[PDB]
Amino acid sequence: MSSLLNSLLPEYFKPKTNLNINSSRVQYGFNARIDMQYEDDSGTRKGSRP
Amino acid sequence: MSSLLNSLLPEYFKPKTNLNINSSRVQYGFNARIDMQYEDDSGTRKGSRP
Numbered sequence: 001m002s003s004l005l006n007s008l009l010p011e012y013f014k015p016k017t018n019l020n021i022n023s024s025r026v027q028y029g030f031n032a033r034i035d036m037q038y039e040d041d042s043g044t045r046k047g048s049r050p
Numbered sequence: 051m052s053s054l055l056n057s058l059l060p061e062y063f064k065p066k067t068n069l070n071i072n073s074s075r076v077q078y079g080f081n082a083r084i085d086m087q088y089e090d091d092s093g094t095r096k097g098s099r100p
Contacts, residue, residue: 015092046092
């Protein structure tokens with residue numbers, strides 16, 4: 001059933017037809033922007049991985 | 051004039067009669083609590099001298 005397996009894919013994922021696989025290992029994932037924060041009695045230390 | 055020289059003294063200063071001076075040098079002043087702060091894009095670093 002193509003229909004039920006299609007709904008499992010994420011909303012942001014827009015797939016194309018061809019995929020040129022040339023190896024026996026693939027790292028599928030996503031890139032996200034994490035805005036980390038460390039608060040303490042002394043003060044706050046902010047970080048950001050884009 | 052005792053009156054005009056009396057008004058120059060601070061409000062918190064409550065003087066007593068006797069002062070036992072035993073040297074040719076005196077460091078008059080006051081003790082205060084300073085709450086310092088350093089803010090920056092990275093974060094805030096707070097200090098306190100009581």
